[PDB]
């Protein structure tokens, strides 16, 4: 607003307005509405008296002597002197108040005013104020309106149009700058008033009640603050408060730290969505059959490649569920498979008939009814929702074995990344080299199998959920792969049955039952599969040095739930790839900086440099670049699969201890104040998660190594 | 029709009518922010879910007539449905692909024209050159850099005006219809986009993207040009680098240098003047930089220099609370200091009156080739850190810092007199003289400054007095960082005070800027500079004086022509012609004046042979006592810095080149201007229907007739007044102009009158 | 624009008998032949046709007062006897940028004994060895070729 | 070594339009860095000055 | 310098016939640098015998310093997809052109 006034008008007029206001002891920086009003006043005044002159014969002319004389731009004494001189020389009568301009051709004092409101009202106010018929009045409006006595407008149409248009453009610019409203508001009759915002009524009492103890009124507090000067208040307070309020540095030197204590209890149980290291896949090396591509056709063809369907029987019971209903679900799945096989008209999707076993398996209608508390307030059994402490558990070795099997390679390639533009720049070529090396490093790793399997599972689940709103859809768990012979192989891990998919929010859950084939025996580690139901569904011949040995082929059935957000997070698992690379490339680049040359080949093909990437009874184990590549990829993929709040809490509260110990290693003489508090905060995060307990064990091992 | 019937429906209800009649168009955009819907969180998940549906794409009703219900395979393209909130029929991606593969075809002739920015990127890439990568430690200094090359650097308001005139012809605000400068770019774009079916909103957005400037704070390690920023990903890395060069066209302007020179001249010529403030203001108000007034450039360009900063302080604006000393932009960061005046005796028995800062202050300096920090106590240098590409940059930066410190130790280390005087022969202040003296030689000071050992740590190294790296010993508080130091992150602009001496004083009573700190170097004006001020052609020289004279003549061409046709004598005795005759030799000016005067006599005697170019060329020569002569001149000498330059009366000359094909006039290569004509029958009515030069006459008037659309105003007769709809639906009475003036010259006479009255 | 409209504009609502200089720049002609110009033009003394798209000067009228004829930046090629007879009083001529093969086609210009200056530029004839001296031999009346005389001296007006 | 190659960049003035026989100019970059006034039978005509 | 001062027809440089297989903009930039350096020399007083241009990006690019392949032993670059012997291939045939006759 003030900046707009300074920029839009001639700077000299700004100076005149500043002087005129300063005559009254005002600062424009505190009041700008008056400043803008005065600037507009001076601008319109000087516009009125411009380009007018008196000819030789006395007639008016446009370009001698100025026909109009300005009085408003001058001081009080100067303006009064000039008006008196005009009165004496031309014998004019003294107006009761100081005019703005003097017209020589008609010899009369004309007052001029620019009004933000209607013209007529301002005309009436001016007439009532002056109370004299010897002064002409000319009122302009920013909107394009004007008025004067008898409509005897002194100027010609051209000059009136110029003034109208200048004011109109000023109004448009003020409006477009978001200041027109305040400008129009500040005009009150014939004066411009400062913006007012005073605390009265409710806020007065509230402020009286929101002050320090030794004050009673907001005004008293303001007076105290205004008159305050810094005289050793802080020094006196420090000299008063007891020494017990202090931050003491506790030395931290090679002996203080201790391992993190894991929670005691029974061994922890698997909780992954799907089987990871115990899965079995029915394979077709080349799907070259009719109607290929549809998941149902591929699933059926994979099914037909296996024989050994024997009568299933509960092996590891669902301790909480109803095992015979799971058995009946599997039997219905098989029967529907045979039926569709003999139909000979396999459609794109298969919808399962609703049944007692299906409805119970997917948790259909097993939910307490909602009632008003007052209606059932007399129930003795009524009690707040159970939200007690989760059962502490113990780290079980199955997690370590799963991770170890995750960070190892496979027989085929589990990634088919898409194409990019041809490399031209040399850096593009180096990037292609590095990307291809990393891809070959982890194009077959197990974690990549997990990524592809989960991606396909969740994609099919969500697509069926949207397409089949109120049907039970049978979704085979299928994956594609490239064998060492370079053949498009298809693998069937199992089947999934989805319940009601009338999903509206991103957190409400759809319940499904997943039946994954397997070759492990749950009875070996029952606590691992305490959420699963296992049916020995067949026998499979496995080849070994002693020929073909028959083994029992199991089928883990479980009931799970997935939310839209969880399905999306499942389909995002491929991003895990990037994470791994982003941690190795930096290292590569780092060494390049210290060597001033590329190091992709001397790292991805030297196979001599190593990093400590594990533990063994002999000591610490060192691994090559590929070992670290797949280790980090597996860690990222598992973090995706075993995400839990306790994981992030422990990570955040353990980073601090990591940094403290590292600072000690760098000989920086670290110190701490309440280290036991940090230990307690870290320990609070270890309750039940297998992943978090494993990470805690890893940190204990690392601390043990680093301390020595 | 549909629109008016919908408006009637809206008016029928009470609430819609109340909102229509109450709210003014000014606040329309305020009631555009009252959306009762709900923004979709995580739109990626929503899109994934939506794509699975049958008809997730919304099309318009007309699609029913062009795309059939089903394709050959009987797939359903569009469904007889409507969207939630409108009549947008529902269609599937099949509809989009069917339209692409079998829809009606047209010509995308305007697409390259509307999308010149993207295709410019394409061309810049297609013609680039690459080079070997280099692997080494990378230092990416952080700074502000352009984004989009090809911009006109217009202010957002100007870009909006251009877009409104180009694509919204009959909906332009009142400012345009009360405007005179019809930018050439606007007419160019209007011609380019004659028949363009592209959505006008898309055209407007693309023009806005094309004509606006944008700046971002990035870490760069190499070239900083705009075309070198769009490929910063491809060029710079954390451990590597890529040699690349765009192969398009660069548009590096030079107006900044012209403004530097103009401000420097203004300050240099006003410091000696009686009233520098009002004088400099009058100059800045009446000066033109390449066809544009300097006030717009000062308000627009973000230049930072002592001259321009003092100009802003005089005019009244905000400037950085810092000074560019010794070629380095300084900036206070911490601490406070008090300025005290003192007299200091140097090592050459020279007494100097200086003002030193006492306090524990800290400053950061950013130069063209270095970056440094300095912690200084009361007349005591405490700590100094510098980082620079070359040793010479290091040395000059350290010399600047030590002279700024103004410590007593160096005072006794001065050898030789300090009597440096700028090119204007104005005594230089003691600190600048000391700076120049130590620039000339500082070995003696280095030997007697101070030497002490320093602990060795990573990332920083010492310096011996011969300016060589050292790890075991350095100078007192002098150190160099092996890694580049990031420049200042922000600048503080505060209210400052300016005195008549063009010294800018802070609110605390200290001084901030002085004209003596302004460099006295002289440059060349790439673009012509025109002045209408007083006898200020002191540094202009003959080269630019000729162009200024021709510009002054052509600005007042109408008045000059009228005077020549009626009162040649008074025109000849005009004061403004004084400097031209200074160049012409004093032994021949009379002959030239007489020859041109008799030529004009013959010209007026004859009719039908009018030639504006000859009159413009030969007018300035007719301003001297016209001694009679008979020899028929053919080349009138024109002295130009000791080099006789002649002017051929007939035909073009190097000192006066007018091209008829382009109707453009230039003098000594430099741009001069152009003439106002087109047909060979003395009229200027043949134009592209420039819709400018209209004056409103208050609210709508019924007598004048039914309101007209702006596009059809062109039919109005000279001076006829009608009713037209300007803005977004504001009917006003407008007229054509009759008096050939403008809004710029208003208030100038009263301005000077009241200025005389106040003083 | 077209020929006839351009000529009418240059005439400046005057009879085609009081023009001493005609400027036809960046005009156009149909079928690459001169149009508009007629015998009425008898006071013209300085003509100029640039970028006019004329294939040949085959419809030039008898401008006996034609002295400074210019046909520059055009593709005129063919016989020049029409220029020799229709305007036998040519003094200054300009054919810069024209399409001319060799001297066998520029020979007819020798008939005009008043041609004090002949200008050629960016033509095929100028490629020939000793073009300047050969043309001077073919046109003895000529005194300034390409704005230069037989001794390479600039030609003041 | 005597056969060591030194690389230079050469800028040469000229007044020939390189759009007449562009094939002759393939290793060169042509700029238009000024205009020259040349005397001819019709006065001082302006022509581009190429580099 | 004196020969240059005899001309006043300088325009803003622009490319009419660009170097198809090369760097067009940097030629313009280095020409501008040459002109600016000559003006700076003009602004000097004690002009030495010769003046060396300061190292600039456009100068290096036009010269070819930044386009010069680096040096490395064959051991460290053998595994390059497009690492070939210098192009000792017979240049392509070119038809006779009349401009040499005129030359």
Curated annotation (Swiss-Prot), chain C:
Any single GO BP term: regulation of apoptotic process
Tissues and organs where the protein is expressed, per its UniProt entry: Expressed in all tissues tested. Highly expressed in kidney and skeletal muscle, moderate levels of expression in brain, placenta and pancreas, and weakly expressed in lung. Found in all regions of the brain examined (amygdala, caudate nucleus, corpus callosum, hippocampus and thalamus), with highest levels in amygdala.
UniProtKB keywords: Cytoplasm, Endoplasmic reticulum, Host-virus interaction, Leucine-rich repeat, Nucleus, Phosphoprotein, Repeat, Repressor, Transcription, Transcription regulation
Transcription regulation is among the record's keywords: yes
The LRRCT domain, residue ranges: 123-157
Post-translational modification remark: Phosphorylated on serine residues, at least in part by casein kinase 2/CK2.
Modified residues annotated as Phosphothreonine in this record: 15
Regions of compositional bias (Basic and acidic residues) in chain numbering: 147-156
List of residues that carry Phosphoserine: 17
A molecular-function term among this protein's GO annotations: RNA binding
Localization (cell): Nucleus; Cytoplasm; Endoplasmic reticulum
LRR repeats: 18-38, 43-64, 65-87, 89-110
Main location: nucleus
Disulfide topology: none
Gene Ontology CC annotation, any one: cytoplasm
Family note: Belongs to the ANP32 family.
Function (record text): Multifunctional protein that is involved in the regulation of many processes including tumor suppression, apoptosis, cell cycle progression or transcription. Promotes apoptosis by favouring the activation of caspase-9/CASP9 and allowing apoptosome formation. In addition, plays a role in the modulation of histone acetylation and transcription as part of the INHAT (inhibitor of histone acetyltransferases) complex. Inhibits the histone-acetyltranferase activity of EP300/CREBBP (CREB-binding protein) and EP300/CREBBP-associated factor by histone masking.
Subunit structure: Component of the SET complex, composed of at least ANP32A, APEX1, HMGB2, NME1, SET and TREX1. Directly interacts with SET. Interacts with ATXN1/SCA1. Interacts with MAP1B. Interacts with ELAVL1. Part of the INHAT (inhibitor of histone acetyltransferases) complex. Interacts with E4F1. (Microbial infection) Interacts (via C-terminus) with influenza virus A protein PB2; this interaction promotes viral replication.
Protein name: Acidic leucine-rich nuclear phosphoprotein 32 family member A
Native species: Homo sapiens
């Amino acid at each position: 607003m003030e900046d707009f006034v300074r920029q839009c008008f001639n700077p000299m007029i700004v100076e005149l307005a500043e002087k005129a206001m300063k005559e009254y002891g005002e600062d424009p920086k505190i009041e700008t509405n008056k400043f803008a009003s005065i600037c507009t006043h001076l601008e319109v005044c000087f516009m009125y008296s411009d380009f007018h002159f008196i000819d030789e014969r006395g007639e008016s002319t446009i370009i001698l002597k100025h026909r109009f004389e300005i009085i408003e731009g001058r001081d009080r004494t100067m303006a009064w002197t000039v008006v008196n001189s005009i009165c004496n020389t031309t014998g004019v009568e003294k107006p009761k108040f100081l005019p703005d301009l003097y017209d020589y051709k008609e010899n009369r004092f004309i007052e001029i005013g620019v009004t933000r409101r209607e013209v007529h009202i301002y005309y009436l106010e001016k007439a009532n104020k002056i109370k004299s018929e010897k002064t002409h009045i000319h009122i302009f409006s920013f909107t394009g309106e004007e008025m004067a006595t008898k409509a005897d407008y002194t100027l010609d149409e051209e000059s009136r149009a110029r003034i109208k248009t200048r004011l109109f453009t000023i109004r448009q610019e003020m409006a477009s700058r978001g200041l027109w409203d305040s400008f129009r508001q500040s005009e009150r009759g014939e004066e411009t008033i400062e913006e007012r915002f005073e605390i009265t009524g409710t806020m007065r009492r509230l402020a009286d009640q929101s002050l320090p103890p030794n004050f009673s009124s907001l005004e008293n507090f303001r007076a105290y603050v205004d008159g305050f000067e810094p005289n050793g208040c802080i020094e006196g307070k420090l000299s008063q408060m007891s020494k017990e309020v202090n931050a003491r540095i506790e030395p931290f030197l090679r002996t203080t730290p201790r391992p993190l204590r894991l929670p005691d209890g029974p061994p922890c149980s698997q909780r992954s969505k799907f089987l990871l290291m115990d899965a079995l896949k029915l394979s077709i090396e080349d799907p070259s059959h009719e109607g290929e591509g549809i998941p149902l056709y591929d699933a059926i063809k994979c099914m037909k490649t296996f024989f050994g369907w024997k009568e299933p029987n509960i092996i590891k019971p669902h301790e909480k569920g109803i095992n015979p209903n799971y058995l009946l679900t599997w039997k219905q799945v098989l029967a529907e498979l045979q039926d569709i096989k003999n139909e000979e008209k396999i459609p794109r999707t298969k919808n399962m008939k609703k049944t007692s076993q299906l409805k119970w398996a997917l948790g259909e209608n097993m939910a307490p009814e909602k009632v008003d508390f007052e209606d059932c307030k007399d129930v003795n059994d009524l009690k707040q929702y159970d939200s007690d402490e989760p059962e502490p558990r113990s780290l079980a070795c199955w997690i370590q074995s799963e991770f170890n099997k995750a960070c190892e390679l496979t027989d085929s390639s589990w990634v088919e990344l898409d194409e990019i533009g041809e490399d031209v720049a040399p850096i593009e070529h180096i990037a292609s080299m590095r990307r291809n090396y990393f891809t070959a490093e982890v194009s077959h790793c197990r974690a990549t199998e997990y990524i592809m399997k989960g991606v396909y599972i969740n994609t099919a689940l969500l697509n069926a959920s949207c397409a089949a709103m109120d049907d039970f859809q049978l979704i085979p768990m299928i994956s594609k792969c490239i064998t060492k012979e370079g053949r498009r192989k298809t693998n069937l891990y199992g089947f999934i049955i989805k319940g009601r998919s009338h999903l509206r929010n991103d957190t409400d859950v759809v319940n499904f039952v997943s039946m994954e084939f397997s070759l492990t025996d749950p009875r070996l580690e029952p606590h691992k599969w305490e959420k699963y139901c296992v049916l020995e569904i067949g026998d499979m011949l496995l080849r070994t040095a002693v020929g073909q040995v028959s083994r029992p082929m199991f089928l883990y059935v479980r009931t799970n739930g997935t939310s839209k957000i969880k399905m999306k997070w499942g389909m995002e698992m491929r991003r895990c790839l990037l994470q791994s690379l982003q941690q190795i490339e930096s290292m590569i680049e780092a060494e390049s900086s210290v060597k001033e040359k590329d190091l992709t080949k001397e790292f991805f093909e030297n196979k001599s440099e190593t990093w400590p990437i594990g533990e063994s009874p002999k000591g610490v184990e060192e691994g090559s670049i590929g070992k670290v590549c797949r280790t980090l990829l597996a860690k990222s993929v598992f973090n995706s699969l075993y995400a839990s709040p306790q994981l992030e809490g422990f990570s955040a509260e353990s980073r601090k201890l990591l940094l403290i110990v590292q600072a000690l290693r760098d000989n920086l003489e670290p110190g701490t104040f309440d280290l036991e508090g940090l230990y307690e905060a870290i320990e609070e995060c270890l309750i039940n998660d297998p992943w978090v307990l494993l990470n805690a064990s890893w940190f204990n091992s690392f601390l043990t190594h680093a301390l020595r | 029709m549909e629109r008016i019937k919908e408006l009637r429906d809206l008016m029928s209800q009470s609430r819609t009518r109340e909102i229509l009649t109450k709210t003014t168009v000014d606040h329309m955009a305020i009631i555009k922010k009252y959306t009762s819907g709900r923004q979709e969180k995580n739109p990626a998940l929503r899109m994934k879910w939506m794509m699975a549906m049958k008809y997730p794409i919304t099309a318009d009703k007309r699609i029913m007539e062009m795309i059939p219900e089903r394709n050959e395979q009987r797939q359903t393209l569009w469904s007889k449905t409507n969207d939630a909130g409108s009549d947008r029929v529902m269609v599937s991606p099949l509809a989009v692909t069917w339209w692409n593969r079998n829809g009606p075809t047209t010509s995308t002739v305007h697409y390259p024209k509307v999308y010149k920015t993207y295709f410019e990127k394409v061309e810049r890439l297609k013609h680039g050159t690459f080079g070997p990568v280099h692997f080494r430690n990378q230092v990416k200094i952080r700074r502000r850099v352009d984004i989009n090359p090809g911009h006109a650097d217009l202010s957002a308001k100007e870009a909006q005006d251009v877009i409104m005139e180009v694509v919204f012809p009959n909906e332009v605000g009142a400012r345009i219809l009360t405007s005179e400068s019809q930018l050439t770019i606007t007419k160019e774009k209007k011609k380019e986009l004659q028949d363009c079916k592209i959505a006008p909103l898309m055209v407007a957005y693309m023009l806005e993207r094309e004509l606006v400037r944008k700046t971002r704070f990035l870490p760069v390690a190499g070239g900083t040009s705009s075309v070198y920023i769009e490929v910063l990903h491809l060029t710079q890395g954390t451990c590597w680098e890529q040699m690349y060069t765009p192969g398009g066209e660069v548009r590096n302007d030079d107006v900044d240098q012209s403004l530097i020179i103009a401000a420097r001249n203004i300050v240099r010529r006003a410091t000696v003047s009686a009233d520098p403030l009002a004088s400099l203001l009058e100059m800045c108000h009446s000066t033109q930089i390449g066809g544009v007034r300097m006030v717009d450039i000062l308000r627009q360009n973000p230049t930072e220099e002592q001259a321009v900063d003092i100009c802003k302080a005089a005019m009244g604006l905000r400037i950085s609370s810092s000074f560019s000393f010794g070629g380095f932009t300084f900036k206070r960061t911490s601490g406070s200091s008090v300025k005290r005046e003192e007299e200091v005796l140097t090592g050459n028995l020279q007494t100097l009156k200086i003002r030193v800062h006492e306090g524990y202050e800290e400053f950061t300096m950013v130069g063209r080739r270095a970056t440094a920090i300095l912690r200084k106590a009361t007349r005591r240098l405490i700590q100094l850190i510098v980082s620079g590409k070359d040793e010479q940059s290091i040395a000059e930066a350290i010399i600047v810092a030590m002279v700024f410190s103004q410590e007593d130790c160096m005072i006794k280390a001065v050898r030789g007199d300090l009597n440096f005087v700028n090119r204007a022969n104005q005594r230089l202040n003691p600190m600048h003289q000391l700076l120049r003296h130590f620039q000339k030689d500082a070995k003696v000071l280095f030997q007697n400054w101070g030497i002490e050992p320093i602990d060795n740590v990573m990332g920083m190294i010492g310096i011996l007095p011969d300016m060589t790296p050292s790890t075991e010993m350095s100078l007192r508080g002098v150190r160099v960082s092996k890694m580049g130091v990031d420049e200042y992150s922000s600048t503080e602009r505060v209210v400052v005070s300016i005195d008549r001496f063009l010294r800018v004083r802070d609110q605390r009573g200290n001084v901030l800027l002085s004209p003596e700190e302004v460099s006295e170097t002289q440059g060349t004006e790439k673009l012509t500079i025109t002045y209408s001020s007083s006898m200020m052609w002191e540094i202009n020289g003959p080269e630019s004086v000729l162009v200024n004279t021709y510009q002054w003549i052509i600005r007042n061409w109408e008045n000059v022509k009228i005077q020549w046709s009626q009162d040649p004598t008074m025109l000849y005795n005009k004061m403004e012609f004084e400097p031209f005759q200074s160049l012409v030799p004093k032994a021949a000016r009379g002959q030239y004046s007489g020859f041109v005067r008799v030529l004009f006599q013959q010209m007026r005697d004859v009719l039908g042979t009018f030639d504006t170019v000859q009159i413009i060329k030969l007018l300035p020569f007719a301003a001297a006592p016209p001694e009679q002569s008979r020899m028929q001149f053919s080349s009138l000498t024109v002295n130009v810095r000791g080099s006789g330059m002649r002017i051929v009366v007939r035909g073009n000359s190097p000192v006066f080149n007018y091209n008829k094909a382009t109707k453009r006039l230039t003098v000594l290569g430099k741009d001069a201007g152009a003439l106002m004509e087109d047909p060979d029958e003395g009229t200027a009515g043949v134009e592209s229907a420039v819709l400018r030069g209209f004056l409103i006459l208050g609210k709508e008037n019924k007598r004048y007739g039914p309101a007209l659309s702006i596009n059809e105003l062109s039919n109005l007769a000279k001076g006829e007044k009608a009713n037209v709809l300007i803005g977004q639906g504001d009917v006003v009475l407008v007229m054509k102009r009759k008096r050939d003036s403008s809004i710029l010259t208003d208030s100038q006479t009263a301005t000077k009158r009241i200025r005389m009255a106040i003083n | 624009m077209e020929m006839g409209r351009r000529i009418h504009l240059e005439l400046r609502n005057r009879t085609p008998s009081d023009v001493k200089e005609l400027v036809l720049d960046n005009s156009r002609s149909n079928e690459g032949k001169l149009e508009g110009l007629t015998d009425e033009f008898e006071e013209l003394e300085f003509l100029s046709t640039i970028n006019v798209g004329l294939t040949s000067i085959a419809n030039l009228p008898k401008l006996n007062k034609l002295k400074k004829l210019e046909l520059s930046d055009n593709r005129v090629s063919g016989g020049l006897e029409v220029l020799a007879e229709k305007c036998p009083n040519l003094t200054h001529l300009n054919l810069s940028g024209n399409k001319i093969k060799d001297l066998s086609t520029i020979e007819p210009l020798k008939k005009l004994e008043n041609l004090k200056s002949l200008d050629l530029f960016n033509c095929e004839v100028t490629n020939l060895n000793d073009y300047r001296e050969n043309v001077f031999k073919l046109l003895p009346q000529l005194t300034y070729l390409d704005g230069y005389d037989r001794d390479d001296k600039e030609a003041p007006d």
